[PDB]
Amino acid sequence: QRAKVAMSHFEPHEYIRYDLLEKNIDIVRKRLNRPLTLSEKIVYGHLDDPANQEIERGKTYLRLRPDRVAMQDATAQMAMLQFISSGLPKVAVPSTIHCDHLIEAQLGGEKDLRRAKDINQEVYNFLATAGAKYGVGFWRPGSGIIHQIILENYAYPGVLLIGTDSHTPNGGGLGGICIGVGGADAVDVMAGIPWELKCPKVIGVKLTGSLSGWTSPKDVILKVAGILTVKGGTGAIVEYHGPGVDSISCTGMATICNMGAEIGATTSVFPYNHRMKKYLSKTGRADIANLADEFKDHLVPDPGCHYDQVIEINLSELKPHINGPFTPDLAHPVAEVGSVAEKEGWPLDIRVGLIGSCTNSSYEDMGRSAAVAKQALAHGLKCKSQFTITPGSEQIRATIERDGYAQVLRDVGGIVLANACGPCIGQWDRKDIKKGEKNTIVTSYNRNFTGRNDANPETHAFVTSPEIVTALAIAGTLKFNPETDFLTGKDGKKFKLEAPDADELPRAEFDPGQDTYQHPPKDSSGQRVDVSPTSQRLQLLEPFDKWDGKDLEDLQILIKVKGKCTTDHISAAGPWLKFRGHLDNISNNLLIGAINIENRKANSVRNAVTQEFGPVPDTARYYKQHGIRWVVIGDENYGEGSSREHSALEPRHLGGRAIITKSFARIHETNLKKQGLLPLTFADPADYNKIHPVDKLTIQGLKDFAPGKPLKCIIKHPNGTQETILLNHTFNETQIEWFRAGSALNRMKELQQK
Numbered sequence: 102q103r104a105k106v107a108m109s110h111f112e113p114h115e116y117i118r119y120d121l122l123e124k125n126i127d128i129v130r131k132r133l134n135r136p137l138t139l140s141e142k143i144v145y146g147h148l149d150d151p152a153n154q155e156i157e158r159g160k161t162y163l164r165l166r167p168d169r170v171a172m173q174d175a176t177a178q179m180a181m182l183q184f185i186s187s188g189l190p191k192v193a194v195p196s197t198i199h200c201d202h203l204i205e206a207q208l209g210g211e212k213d214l215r216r217a218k219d220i221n222q223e224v225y226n227f228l229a230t231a232g233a234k235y236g237v238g239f240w241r242p243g244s245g246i247i248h249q250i251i252l253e254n255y256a257y258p259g260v261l262l263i264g265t266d267s268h269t270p271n272g273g274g275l276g277g278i279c280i281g282v283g284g285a286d287a288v289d290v291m292a293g294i295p296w297e298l299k300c301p302k303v304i305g306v307k308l309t310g311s312l313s314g315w316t317s318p319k320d321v322i323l324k325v326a327g328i329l330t331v332k333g334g335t336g337a338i339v340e341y342h343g344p345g346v347d348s349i350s351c352t353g354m355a356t357i358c359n360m361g362a363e364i365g366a367t368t369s370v371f372p373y374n375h376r377m378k379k380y381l382s383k384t385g386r387a388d389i390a391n392l393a394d395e396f397k398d399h400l401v402p403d404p405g406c407h408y409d410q411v412i413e414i415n416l417s418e419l420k421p422h423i424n425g426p427f428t429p430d431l432a433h434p435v436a437e438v439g440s441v442a443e444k445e446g447w448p449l450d451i452r453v454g455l456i457g458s459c460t461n462s463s464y465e466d467m468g469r470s471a472a473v474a475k476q477a478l479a480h481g482l483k484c485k486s487q488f489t490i491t492p493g494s495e496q497i498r499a500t501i502e503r504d505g506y507a508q509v510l511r512d513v514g515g516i517v518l519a520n521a522c523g524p525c526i527g528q529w530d531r532k533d534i535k536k537g538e539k540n541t542i543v544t545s546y547n548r549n550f551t552g553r554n555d556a557n558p559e560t561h562a563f564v565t566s567p568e569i570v571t572a573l574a575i576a577g578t579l580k581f582n583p584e585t586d587f588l589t590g591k592d593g594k595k596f597k598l599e600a601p602d603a604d605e606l607p608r609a610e611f612d613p614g615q616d617t618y619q620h621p622p623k624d625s626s627g628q629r630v631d632v633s634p635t636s637q638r639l640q641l642l643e644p645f646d647k648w649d650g651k652d653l654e655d656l657q658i659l660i661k662v663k664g665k666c667t668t669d670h671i672s673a674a675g676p677w678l679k680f681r682g683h684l685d686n687i688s689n690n691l692l693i694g695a696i697n698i699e700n701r702k703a704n705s706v707r708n709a710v711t712q713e714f715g716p717v718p719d720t721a722r723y724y725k726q727h728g729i730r731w732v733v734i735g736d737e738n739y740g741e742g743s744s745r746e747h748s749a750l751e752p753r754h755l756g757g758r759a760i761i762t763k764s765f766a767r768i769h770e771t772n773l774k775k776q777g778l779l780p781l782t783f784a785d786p787a788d789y790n791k792i793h794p795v796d797k798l799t800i801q802g803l804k805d806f807a808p809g810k811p812l813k814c815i816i817k818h819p820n821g822t823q824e825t826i827l828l829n830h831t832f833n834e835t836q837i838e839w840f841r842a843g844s845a846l847n848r849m850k851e852l853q854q855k
C-alpha cells in the first residue's frame with residue numbers, strides 16, 4: 102500500500118489493504134453500473150478475480166479471500182486436525198485460537214479456571230503447540246471469549262474475517278464483514294485457496310431516532326428478530342443504516358450484529374462512523390481510525406444502494422424487550438411479559454439471572470448494570486434471584502474490576518464467572534434446580550433454544566439486556582417492570598429504579614491484564630505436535646471413502662425428523678465437548694435429540710432388520726457394519742444454529758450418504774458438502790409426506806450430476822409401488838468435485854500429488 106498500518110499489534114508486518122479494497126470495488130463498480138451497498142463494497146472488494154467474477158445476489162458463488170481466520174477451542178481442534186491432514190507447512194493468512202468453550206461454571210472465576218486447565222491440559226496443549234508449530238496466535242484459557250477478543254483487538258472497518266463460530270457476525274459492530282463457518286472452510290483460507298460464499302441478498306434495517314432510558318442496543322435486534330423470525334434472515338446480510346446508527350456505541354452495534362445469527366443472516370454490518378473511530382482509539386488503534394477516515398467513501402453504503410427488503414425502526418419509540426421462552430423471536434415488551442407468563446403457564450419468579458457473555462459484556466454494559474445495582478444496594482436491597490456475571494475478556498474483567506463495577510455487582514450478590522462462554526453453550530454445573538424442574542432464568546445472551554443453558558428441557562429462558570436482567574434479578578420476578586413499578590427497600594419505603602446512566606468507554610485507558618496471549622515462534626523449526634495414539638480426547642483423521650461412481654440405490658431411512666432439527670439435536674454440546682477432537686467418540690451422540698416422526702420420541706428409531714426400537718447412533722453403526730447406506734429425511738431449516746462441523750462429519754462416519762430436507766441452514770449445508778455427503782431439498786415440500794421410514798430410496802443421476810440439473814429419487818414402497826420425485830441441490834462444479842473425491846479435503850489433496 103502507500104500507507105503501512107498493521108492489521109493489529111500481534112501481526113505488525115501484515116498491513117491493511119484498503120488500496121486493494123478500493124481497486125476491486127472500482128473494478129466491480131464499473132461492471133455493475135449501480136450503487137453498491139456497504140456489504141457489497143466489502144464483499145466484492147475481496148473477490149479473488151473482480152474483473153471475471155459473475156455477481157448475482159442469491160445466485161452466484163463468490164470466490165473470496167478473507168483477511169484473517171479466528172477459531173474457538175471447541176471447533177479449532179477438528180479445524181487443526183483437518184489442517185494437519187492437508188500436509189501444508191504453515192497457515193496462509195493471520196489466524197488465532199481462543200480458549201473459551203471448555204471451562205465449566207461451578208464455583209466462580211479463579212476456581213473454575215484452575216479446574217478447566219487441570220481437566221483439559223491435553224487439548225489446550227495440542228492447540229498451543231499446533232499454534233506454535235503452524236503459526237496461529239494462541240489466546241490462553243481464561244483470556245476471553247473469541248468475539249470480544251476479536252472486537253477489542255482484531256476487527257477493523259473493511260476486514261473480511263471468517264470464524265468457526267456462529268456469533269462471529271459480532272465483528273460487524275466495527276464495520277467488518279465477519280462470517281461464521283465450519284472448520285473445513287477455515288482450513289481453505291488457512292491453506293491459501295479461495296473461499297466460496299453464495300452471493301448474499303441484503304436486508305436493510307434503517308435506524309431513525311435515538312435510544313432512551315431503559316432501551317439498549319440489545320432491544321433493536323430483539324425487535325428485529327421478532328419481526329423477521331429465525332427463518333427471516335437466511336441467505337442475506339442485515340446492513341444497518343439511517344440517522345439512528347450514530348446514536349449507538351460500537352459495542353452496542355456489535356450486540357445487534359451478534360444476535361443477527363439467530364434469524365439466520367449470513368452476517369450483519371454497520372457503516373464506519375465516529376462511534377467506531379472512538380472505540381478504535383480507546384482500544385489502541387488510533388492509526389486504524391485515521392487510515393479509515395481517508396478511505397471512508399469505501400466504508401459506508403453508496404447513496405441509493407438497493408436493499409432487497411427494508412425494515413424501519415424508530416429508536417425513540419422503542420422500549421425494553423424480553424424474548425422467549427423457547428426461541429429468540431417470540432418478542433415481548435418488558436411491560437407485558439408478566440401477564441403472558443401467567444396466561445401462558447410460565448414460571449414467574451426468576452430463578453437465576455445471568456448477564457455477560459460476548460453479547461453483553463462491554464464496559465458500557467457492565468456499567469449500566471452496576472448503575473442499577475448501586476440503587477438497590479442504596480436501599481439495603483440485594484438480588485432476590487441467584488446472579489452471575491461473565492466478562493467477555495481479561496481486559497474487561499481487569500478494567501471493570503479496577504473502576505469498581507465488579508465489586509458493586511458482588512455486593513448485590515452476583516458471582517463473577519471465568520472469561521469463558523460458560524452457561525451460554527450449556528457448560529454449567531447448575532444446582533438450584535432438580536432435573537426436569539419447571540423454572541424461569543433470564544440472561545443477557547442470545548440463543549435460548551431448549552436445554553441450551555442447563556439441559557433441563559423445562560427451563561424457560563428469556564434473553565434481554567444486562568440492565569433489565571439485574572433489575573429483574575433483584576425483583577426475582579418477571580412480574581416486575583423497572584420502568585414503572587416500585588420496590589420496597591429495607592427501610593419500608595418504596596422507591597423506583599432510575600434508568601441507568603454510564604460511560605460508554607473508560608474515562609481512563611483499558612487494563613489489558615497479564616499473560617493472555619502466546620506468540621507463534623517463527624523460530625521453532627522443530628515444533629512438534631503429538632496426538633498420543635490411544636487418547637480419548639484427540640484422534641487423527643482418516644480419509645473418507647471416495648465416491649464409487651455409482652448411484653445410491655435402496656437407502657434405508659435411519660430417521661425421518663419431525664419438526665425443528667437444530668445442530669444441537671444432531672451433535673449435542675454439554676458433555677460431548679470433551680470429545681470435540683475425537684470423531685469416533687463424539688459420533689455416539691449422532692441425532693439423539695431429534696424427534697422421530699414415527700413414535701414422537703428422541704433417540705429411539707426402529708432398526709430395519711431386528712424390528713426393535715433403540716438409539717440412533719447404535720442403529721446407524723449397525724447399518725454401517727452390515728453394509729446399509731442410509732439417508733436422514735428432515736423438515737424446515739435443518740441444521741439450524743451453531744457452526745459445529747461435527748453435525749456433518751458424524752453422519753459421514755457412521756455410513757450416511759444423504760440428508761433430504763425441505764430447507765437447510767447455510768453453515769450446516771456447506772459442512773455436509775465439505776464432508777462428501779449429499780444435501781438435497783425436495784423440489785416440492787409436499788413430497789416429504791410421500792416418504793415413510795419403511796420406504797427405501799434410490800438417488801439417481803450422480804453420473805451426470807450437474808449444477809442446476811435436479812436429481813431424481815425413486816421411492817420404493819413395501820407393497821411394490823414406487824414413486825419418483827425430484828431433488829434439488831446447490832452444488833456448483835467446485836462442490837461436485839468435493840463430492841467425487843469423498844470430501845473437500847480429499848480433493849484438496851488431489852491438487853498436489855493426488
Ligand SMILES: O=C(O)CC(CC(=O)O)C(=O)O
Binds near residue numbers: 159299301335766831
Ligand atoms: O438455498 C440456497 O441456495 C442457500 C441459502 C443460504 C445461503 O447460502 O445464503 C440462500 O441462498 O438463501
Ligand code: SF4
Binds near residue numbers: 248268460522525
Ligand atoms: S457460546 Fe455464547 S459467549 Fe461463547 S462465543 Fe457463543 S455467543 Fe459468545
